Nucleic acid binder design. Structure first.
Ligand SMILES: [K+]
Ligand SMILES: [K+]
Ligand SMILES: [K+]
Ligand SMILES: [K+]
Ligand SMILES: [K+]
Ligand SMILES: [K+]
Ligand SMILES: [K+]
Ligand SMILES: [Mg+2]
Ligand SMILES: [Mg+2]
Ligand SMILES: [Mg+2]
Ligand SMILES: [Mg+2]
Ligand SMILES: [Mg+2]
Ligand SMILES: [Mg+2]
Ligand SMILES: [Mg+2]
Ligand SMILES: [Mg+2]
Ligand SMILES: [Mg+2]
Ligand SMILES: [Mg+2]
Ligand SMILES: [Mg+2]
Ligand SMILES: [Mg+2]
Ligand SMILES: [Mg+2]
Ligand SMILES: [Mg+2]
Ligand SMILES: [Mg+2]
Ligand SMILES: [Mg+2]
Ligand SMILES: [Mg+2]
Ligand SMILES: [Mg+2]
Ligand SMILES: [Mg+2]
Ligand SMILES: [Mg+2]
Ligand SMILES: [Mg+2]
Ligand SMILES: [Mg+2]
Ligand SMILES: [Mg+2]
Ligand SMILES: [Mg+2]
Ligand SMILES: [Mg+2]
Ligand SMILES: [Mg+2]
Ligand SMILES: [Mg+2]
Ligand SMILES: [Zn+2]
Lengths: 119, 53, 118, 110
RNA sequence: UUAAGUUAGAAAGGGCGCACGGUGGAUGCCUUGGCACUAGGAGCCGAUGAAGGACGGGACGAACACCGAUAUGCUUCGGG
RNA sequence: GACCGAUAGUGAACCAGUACCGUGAGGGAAAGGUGAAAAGCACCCCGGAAGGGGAGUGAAAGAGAUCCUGAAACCGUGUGCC
RNA sequence: AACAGUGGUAGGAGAGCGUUCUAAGGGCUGUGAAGCCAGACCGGAAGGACUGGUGGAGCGCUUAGAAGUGAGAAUGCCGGUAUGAGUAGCGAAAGAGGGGUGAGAAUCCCCUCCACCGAAUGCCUAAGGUUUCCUGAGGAAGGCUCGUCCGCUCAGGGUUAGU
């Protein structure tokens, strides 16, 4: 099983890709708890490609990650950060690259929010 | 389909027995001492599991 | 000159509502249904003042029958025997003795048996 | 001794305010503020302000210790209704009652 | 202790009573306005531009009332 | 005036032939009451405000602005009996 | 006193209760009128007192007079408020995160990427609307949620022709 998150197949993929790149860039995002729970598996699978490091793994990641600037100073893309900084940080760690922390409901819709961050 | 008879005050009240809020699943924060939701970050001090978030 | 509706309506309706105190839900609250119930209560009260006299006589007879049968008589024979003896003590009083002073009741039952055994 | 606060003609339906009030009625004021803070309902912030106002009245006006306070009375009365109309199909209008609440809290010393 | 028997009490909520409020605008009291008349007056205004309007006029926004580029008033004669 | 007294009396006691409705002719509402006097609540407190609790004014503020009285439906809080 | 009688629709007859106003007489009332609320009182009924609370200025009683004189029903009229019910609904559509502002932010601003229209969902311009335009301030109501925002509220501003 996997969550649908109230979106069509394409909308959901697009959202998970957006969130995946957001977490790579920011290292810590706030979203709905259920979005965060789906994002764990997707992001950790991207980090696995990063840790592999080979061209084939990079092109697989490039099919998923958005073309967004990670570091404006260095002119580093999100894909480049994944294969440089993130992959290096989690060289010795075997899985569990993210953690979710629950924040409680937001005002407008009572939606249970969460921080998801790189460990 | 429409109500054949109006609902009495009694029956309305009987129906609303279960239409009720529960008390939040709350515990004392070990950092700051304010109540927080269990398994959630404390909104007051930003702590969780003895760590500032 | 114009006569406004005024206070007479409220006063009349409120008296009906006070007679409907203790009635269930809307029957103590709303004039129309309270009125109907107070009226119905009148019919019932009149009927039941009559039925009360039937129900107590029924109760006394049942108790006399029980006491009579402890003395080896049915109610039917006891009352026949009391009538023959010329004892005119009524069922309320006989049932009172049956409960309160059964020895006195037994004497009256013995008096009845004396006439029956003639 | 008692200290009262009232928020009159708050734009929230009485039934919805009463749901939250039923959680805090009888409670110690500290516990009540915690419940309201962690109850995700529209009435919670409104009721919280009335409670804190009653506590402030208790401290300032009557010289009562805020740590010893209990909610002795708590109730929502109906305020005046704002009548609105929603256009329905077939050129019919249907009434919308935008209801208001009077929210009373009374705090007393335990 | 075991057996058999009996009977309490319970309130998620509810019913009746009572107390205290809210809503709502009945009722009473009140009258700025009406209704019907009586007595007397007056029964027509207009090309010397009427009735009725529009637009304007004030130290101050709009509106009312008043006024008409002499505009929130001008002259004169009386009153006070 | 052995006429009305705010659902009455004019449609209109109130900025009403208005608002509103209708292409138009035309149809056509609702809406009176602080107090004797504004003396219309300085100041303090909670609150972003609204609103409130004190304080003050007043004979009265539960007369604090659709502010005399304030019924009923209806909505609540408490609990004596069930 | 005695004797007899006293179910009742249509309907006939009689005796009364209460309401507003008037006349006359006699009273009550700021030491608290009417109204309103409550009560375990009184009368054969309609009904009438008494006591307390609220109320804050009017009102009974007696006799007679006059009537807009009594409501529970008219799919009655007007107003208020219920029930259904925290129910149906919230009106075609892609957003996500970061930063900001703020008492408060899914909803306002900015940024990034994503997505949609593209013989239009672009640009111009009629009719029609009539200030909705711009700037600053605002958040009661309107906005089907929210709101710091707005075609909304308050200020001030803005439309230039011989062609
Ligand atoms: K109970
Ligand atoms: K009218
Ligand atoms: K009760
Ligand atoms: K009185
Ligand atoms: K009717
Ligand atoms: K096309
Ligand atoms: K704004
Ligand atoms: Mg597709
Ligand atoms: Mg992104
Ligand atoms: Mg009159
Ligand atoms: Mg009437
Ligand atoms: Mg008989
Ligand atoms: Mg239509
Ligand atoms: Mg001529
Ligand atoms: Mg009136
Ligand atoms: Mg009228
Ligand atoms: Mg028109
Ligand atoms: Mg009062
Ligand atoms: Mg007065
Ligand atoms: Mg009043
Ligand atoms: Mg007869
Ligand atoms: Mg008979
Ligand atoms: Mg007749
Ligand atoms: Mg009168
Ligand atoms: Mg009295
Ligand atoms: Mg009549
Ligand atoms: Mg529900
Ligand atoms: Mg249903
Ligand atoms: Mg359903
Ligand atoms: Mg639904
Ligand atoms: Mg929509
Ligand atoms: Mg396309
Ligand atoms: Mg604009
Ligand atoms: Mg809104
Ligand atoms: Zn904490």
């Amino acid at each position: 099983s996997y969550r649908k998150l109230g979106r069509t197949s394409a909308q959901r993929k697009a959202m998970l890709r957006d969130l995946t790149t957001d977490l790579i860039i920011n290292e810590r995002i706030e979203t709905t708890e259920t979005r965060a729970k789906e994002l764990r598996s997707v992001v950790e699978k991207m980090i696995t490609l990063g840790k592999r490091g080979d061209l084939h793994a990079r092109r697989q990641a490039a099919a998923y990650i958005r073309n967004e600037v990670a570091n404006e100073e260095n002119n580093q893309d999100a894909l480049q950060k994944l294969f440089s900084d993130i992959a290096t940080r989690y060289e010795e760690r075997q899985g569990g690259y993210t953690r979710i922390m629950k924040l409680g409901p937001r005002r407008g819709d009572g939606a249970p929010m969460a921080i998801i961050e790189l460990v | 389909a429409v109500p054949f008879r109006r609902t009495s005050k009694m029956k309305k009240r009987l129906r609303r027995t279960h239409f009720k809020l529960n008390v939040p699943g709350m515990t004392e924060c070990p950092s700051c001492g304010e109540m927080k939701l269990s398994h959630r970050v404390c909104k007051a001090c930003g702590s969780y599991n003895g760590k500032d978030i | 000159p114009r006569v406004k509706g005024g206070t007479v309506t409220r006063k009349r309706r409120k008296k009906v509502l006070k007679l409907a105190k203790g009635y269930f839900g809307s029957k103590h609250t709303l004039y129309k249904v309270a009125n109907q119930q107070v009226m119905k209560s009148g019919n019932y009260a009149f009927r039941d003042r009559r039925q009360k006299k039937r129900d107590f006589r029924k109760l006394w007879i049942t108790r006399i029958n029980a006491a009579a049968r402890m003395n080896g008589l049915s109610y039917s024979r006891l009352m026949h025997g009391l009538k023959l003896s010329g004892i005119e003590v009524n069922r309320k009083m006989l049932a009172d003795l049956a409960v309160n002073d059964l020895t006195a009741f037994n004497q009256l039952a013995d008096a009845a048996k004396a006439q029956l055994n003639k | 001794m008692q200290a009262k606060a009232v928020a009159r003609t708050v734009r929230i339906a009485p039934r919805k305010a009463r749901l939250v009030m039923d959680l805090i009625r009888g409670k110690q004021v500290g516990e009540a503020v915690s419940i309201l803070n962690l109850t995700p309902r529209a009435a919670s912030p409104i009721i919280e302000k009335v409670l804190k106002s009653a506590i402030a009245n208790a401290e300032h006006n009557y010289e009562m210790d805020a740590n010893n306070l209990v909610i002795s009375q708590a109730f929502v009365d109906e305020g005046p209704t704002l009548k609105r109309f929603r256009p329905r199909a077939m050129g019919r209008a249907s009434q919308i009652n935008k209801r208001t609440s009077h929210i009373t809290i009374v705090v007393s010393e335990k």
